[PDB]
Design a protein around this ligand. Sequence first.
Ligand SMILES: c1csc(-c2ncc[nH]2)c1
Length: 281
Amino acid sequence: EMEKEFEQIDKSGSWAAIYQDIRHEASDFPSRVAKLPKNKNRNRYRDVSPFDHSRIKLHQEDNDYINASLIKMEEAQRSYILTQGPLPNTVGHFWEMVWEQKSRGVVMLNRVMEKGSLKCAQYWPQKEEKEMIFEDTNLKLTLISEDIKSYYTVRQLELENLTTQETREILHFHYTTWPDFGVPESPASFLNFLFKVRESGSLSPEHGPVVVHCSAGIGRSGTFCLADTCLLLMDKRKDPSSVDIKKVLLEMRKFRMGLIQTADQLRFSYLAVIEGAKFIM
Ligand SMILES: c1csc(-c2ncc[nH]2)c1
């Protein structure tokens, strides 16, 4: 059981050691499309790239590239798209991908500004009456409603395909209280946030994969997906304690590099799963 393994690593203070072994054991696959010169300005960080095998392709004939990865968890019957914070230039591309993958939810784990820098373009409208048009990708985005709470905000958006006049409701789940440095003290509000996303049906197989992003789409994003998947496998399996979070993390890392950036995020993920297991059992 992971609870006892938690105390072990914690009492021994071995988090940097565990984390380093995971770094060592992680998959490395080609990312040739990410590195093409024509895609240089479609990437926020030069050392964060989608693998070619799991990358999301845009259905535009010109350049199909976006910094985004499909993570398929076969046993848990869960899929996620992990992507970077859109850039000023890639906001049209981001919404094109939401449209093409038939996603119902966007999950954002960063503020637009953190540490006095921009982590992310402002990619949704701030007022009902000021909708956004993406001329490059022929989409229109309207804020329908906005429910602001202590730890997070939920926004209903309408996405319209200007080409075909089809519309879809997209839910934007925005966790607004992740601290600028380190990880939250308690996983309580993060679990609450995870339960709210699940309840929306955005993680459900009747929809395309949820889109999850922070700035790089690997650190906080990773914690989101790792916690969701581990909790789901604890429901599914005959023996819930068969679930090894290190194994699950290594299976997710086949799909996107660098998921969980720090030993702190690793520890927080254990704590999120351990605490969420109580509510589930
Ligand atoms: C941060 C990293 S790259 C970037 C950017 N790309 C295009 C405009 N601003 C902002």
